[PDB]
């Protein structure tokens, strides 16, 4: 019955954690276990990505198209939900995406983008995002309207292979201002922009230790 975490919240469940949901497209992707953040600004957020120090290698997110398509990781630790699943959820209705970022000093920033959705695999999971708001700085905006790229599939608009240079699966442009699926370098680093970066806040030489991407219906 519940199609996402907002529905789960409206049904009375107030605690954060894993829940089974029935997206409207369950006939194809099936039911899914998702992590629901029921605390941030009222709750009802379905988490689609998370980075943290959970024991996985620093290059854990350095995976090919197939892995990003199907998803990988544990929803209670660091993971990527899966593009087919993200497509299924973002298309069942209108969602906004929220980015929660935290640095090593435990300070935090967030960014909200309305009308968040991606197209299906045939269209290379092209990204769509609306207006920005928040205090982290608008570093995801430049990615609007770009294809998804991975180490084995260059779909960006640069002469080089953005994914191989910056190490993640992302909607690379030429190449990025945000790189949340990059290497887990934990803090300051000399290498150039290949860690978990959010340019508008910490520049290109600081890999955020903890980040999360989560969605909630606009009509919440
Ligand atoms: C990590 C990254 O993509 N840095 C690019 C830089 O290579 C490019 O020359 C410049 C053009 O303005 O824009 C930056 O955002
Ligand atoms: Ca290229």
Q: Is 143 labelled a binding residue?
A: no
Q: Which ligand is nearest to the CA of 174?
A: 1
Structural domain spans, the chain = 1-136+210-220, 137-209
Atom index in ligand 1 nearest the CA of residue 142 equals 15
Q: Is 155 labelled a binding residue?
A: no
Residue 155 backbone class (left: φ over 0; alpha: ψ -120 to 50; beta: rest): alpha
Distance in angstroms (rounded) separating the CA atoms of residues 206 and 107: 14
How far apart are the CA of 8 and the centre of ligand 2, in A?
Answer: 41
How far apart are the CA of 176 and the centre of ligand 1, in A?
Answer: 7
Query: Which residues are paired to 117 by β-bridges?
Result: 128
Distance in angstroms (rounded) separating the CA atoms of residues 156 and 43: 34
Which residues, 6+ apart, have CB-to-CB distance to 54 below 8 Å? 74, 77, 78
Query: Which residues are paired to 49 by β-bridges?
Result: 80, 213
Q: Which of 189, 185, 178 is nearest to 213 (CA)?
A: 178
176 lines ligand 1 (CB under 6 A): yes
194 lines ligand 1 (CB under 6 A): no
* H-type alpha helices, 105-179: 162-166
Report which secondary-structure segment, H or E, holds 93: none
Q: How far is CA 24 from CA 16, 110, 208, in A?
A: 22, 29, 34
175 lines ligand 1 (CB under 6 A): yes
Q: Which of 146, 118, 140, 112 is nearest to 42 (CA)?
A: 112
Longest dimension (CA), the chain: 51
Options 3.40.50.300, 1.10.10.60, 1.10.287.70, 3.90.215.10; CATH for 1-136+210-220 is 3.90.215.10
Q: How far is CA 49 from CA 58, 182, 193, in A?
A: 16, 12, 20
Handedness of CA 133, 44, 115, 166 (dihedral sign): positive
5 lines ligand 1 (CB under 6 A): no
193 lines ligand 1 (CB under 6 A): yes
Cis peptide before 191 (omega within 30 of 0): no
| Overall size of the chain counted in residues | 220
Handedness of CA 110, 201, 183, 66 (dihedral sign): positive
To one decimal, the resolution in angstroms is: 2.0
Q: Is 90 labelled a binding residue?
A: no
Q: How far is CA 95 from CA 11, 12, 46, 182, 214, in A?
A: 19, 21, 10, 25, 10
Distance in angstroms (rounded) separating the CA atoms of residues 24 and 185: 38
Contact 87, 122 (CB under 8 A): no
CA 187 to chain centre: 20
Q: Which of 185, 159, 155 is nearest to 170 (CA)?
A: 155
CATH, domain range 137-209: 4.10.530.10
Query: Which residues are paired to 150 by β-bridges?
Result: 153
């Amino acid at each position: 019955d519940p199609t996402d975490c907002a529905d789960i919240l409206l049904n009375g469940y107030r605690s954060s954690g894993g829940y089974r949901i029935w997206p409207k497209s369950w006939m194809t992707v099936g039911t899914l276990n998702v992590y629901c953040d029921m605390e941030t600004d009222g709750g009802g957020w379905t988490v689609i990505q998370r980075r943290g120090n959970y024991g996985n290698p620093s290059d854990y997110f350095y995976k090919p198209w197939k892995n990003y398509k199907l998803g990988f990781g544990n929803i209670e630790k660091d993971f990527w939900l899966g593009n087919d699943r993200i497509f299924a959820l973002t298309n069942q209705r209108n969602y906004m995406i929220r980015f929660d970022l935290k640095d090593k000093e435990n300070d935090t920033r967030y960014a909200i983008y309305q009308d968040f959705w991606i197209e299906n695999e045939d269209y290379l999971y092209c990204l769509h995002i609306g207006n920005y708001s928040g205090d982290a700085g608008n570093s995801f905006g430049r990615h609007n309207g770009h294809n998804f790229s991975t180490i084995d599939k260059d779909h960006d608009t640069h002469e080089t292979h953005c994914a191989q240079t910056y190490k993640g699966g992302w909607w690379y442009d030429r190449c990025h201002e945000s790189n949340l699926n990059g290497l887990y370098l934990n803090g300051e680093h000399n290498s150039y922009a290949d860690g978990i970066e959010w340019r508008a806040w910490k520049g290109y030489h600081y890999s955020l230790p903890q980040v999360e991407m989560k969605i909630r219906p606009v009509e919440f």
